[PDB]
């Protein structure tokens, strides 16, 4: 078996930058003068499309600003003038030894100025509570960069293992992300505590922002 690893995993560039992704292999990928490595481009919710084959050859309709170099155990993909259409996730795939494995992927995303999130907390609807479950929802709106931490605190006890998050794709107009987090308690446990708090740490924020409500004062 043979294992590829890409670097970096995330890369932030602007239109016109020259950008280089690296695929490293656990074995040599050359045989018979053939470099046995392939590059793919994938966009959210689409099948992959081949960019490069035999390390350095352009696939059909792949513009010339995409190129690849390398030999043996280390390979690179270079995009010379980033075009808007190029922000993508890129995979390397080895074709010498059979599992045909892929690497983990490298996401190329749009660089922009730091933007602090807008934070909103939502208490559970009356309707839901009578069913017996409380979902508390915390919203981080239109922030960049992507890295963000949400901490749930109930009566200033930080929660673990009862929240789930999901994040939106980078916004095509303003190049920010948004994040929704959900804190799930039983009706019974929700009724024992007064303070429900959503604390958000982000590079845009001099210090964490808390949004909270007090149950029964809502």
């Amino acid at each position: 078996d043979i294992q590829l690893t890409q670097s970096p995993s995330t890369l932030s560039a602007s239109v016109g930058d020259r950008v280089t992704i690296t695929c490293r292999a656990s074995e040599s990928l050359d045989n018979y003068g053939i470099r046995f490595l392939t590059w793919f481009q994938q966009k959210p919710g689409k099948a992959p499309k081949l960019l490069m084959y035999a390390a350095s050859n352009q696939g059909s309709g792949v513009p010339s600003r995409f190129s690849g170099s390398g030999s043996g155990t280390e390979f690179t993909l270079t995009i010379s003038s980033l075009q808007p259409d190029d922000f993508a996730t890129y995979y390397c795939q080895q074709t010498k030894e059979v599992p045909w494995s892929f690497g983990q992927g490298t996401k190329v995303e749009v660089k922009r100025t730091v933007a602090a999130p807008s934070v909103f907390i939502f208490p559970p609807s009356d309707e839901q509570l009578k069913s017996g479950t409380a979902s508390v929802v915390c919203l981080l709106n239109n922030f960049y960069p992507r890295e963000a931490k949400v901490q749930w605190k109930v009566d200033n006890a930080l929660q673990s293992g009862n929240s789930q998050e999901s994040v939106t794709e980078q916004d095509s107009k303003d190049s920010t992300y948004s994040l929704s987090s959900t804190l799930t308690l039983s009706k019974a446990d929700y009724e024992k505590h007064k303070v429900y708090a959503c604390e958000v740490t982000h590079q845009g924020l001099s210090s964490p922002v808390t949004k909270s409500f007090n149950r029964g004062e809502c």
Partner: protein, 211 residues
């Protein structure tokens, strides 16, 4: 121009099996899979002209790769399906390079069964921007669509990717930001659809009172 049209999405209970069709128009046929948000994983290949097949060790004796030559169709059969097998599945023509991909076929493998969502409002609080939305909760399987005011309000909407709960049902939020100055002159209804249960719901969303 080379095209590979795969069969539609499948929802299968554990221990059951699934057969994905791949129809060619216009070499090797590879099968690859990707779990949502994950990297890709090669299952196997078949050379239609001798029926010669090779498989990834992971899928010894669950995978069956076949072709119907007279209908230009490849098939991928995967037995004894388990949770870990939920993935988009693609057939690929190998050049020898995997140069032509199908659109992919979502296979969902879960002990769970069809359930419509409960839609609960996310009501705003109070400051000049207002955040409101809908919690579309405890439904199965994906997807649900979500719109606002019948698609009139599209600006500022974020519909989030569902999360799979420990219960094994899905739940997602859809939120929108609007001027505070509008919540007394303009109504906000989220329109939530789930086809797999024929669930259509419209839920109006307004800030709450009693302070």
């Amino acid at each position: 121009e080379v095209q590979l049209v795969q069969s539609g999405a499948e929802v299968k209970k554990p221990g059951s099996s699934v057969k994905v069709s791949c129809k060619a128009s216009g070499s090797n046929i590879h099968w690859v899979r990707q779990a949502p948000g994950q990297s890709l994983e090669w299952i196997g290949y078949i050379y239609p002209y001798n029926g010669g097949t090779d498989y990834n060790q992971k899928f010894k004796n669950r995978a069956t790769l076949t072709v119907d030559n007279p209908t230009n169709t490849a098939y991928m059969e995967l037995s004894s399906l388990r949770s870990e097998d939920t993935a988009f599945y693609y057939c690929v023509n190998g050049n020898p390079w995997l140069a032509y991909w199908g659109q992919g076929t979502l296979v969902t493998v879960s002990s769970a069964s069809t359930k419509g969502p409960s839609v609960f409002p996310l009501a705003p609080s109070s400051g000049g921007t207002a955040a409101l939305g809908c919690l579309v909760k405890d439904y199965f399987p994906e997807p649900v669509t979500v719109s606002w005011n019948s698609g009139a309000l599209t600006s500022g909407v974020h519909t989030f990717p569902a999360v799979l709960q420990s219960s094994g049902l899905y739940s997602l939020s859809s939120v929108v930001t609007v001027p505070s100055s509008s919540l007394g002159t303009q109504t906000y209804i989220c329109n939530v659809n789930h086809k797999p249960s024929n669930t259509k719901v419209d839920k109006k969303v307004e800030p709450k009172s009693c302070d």
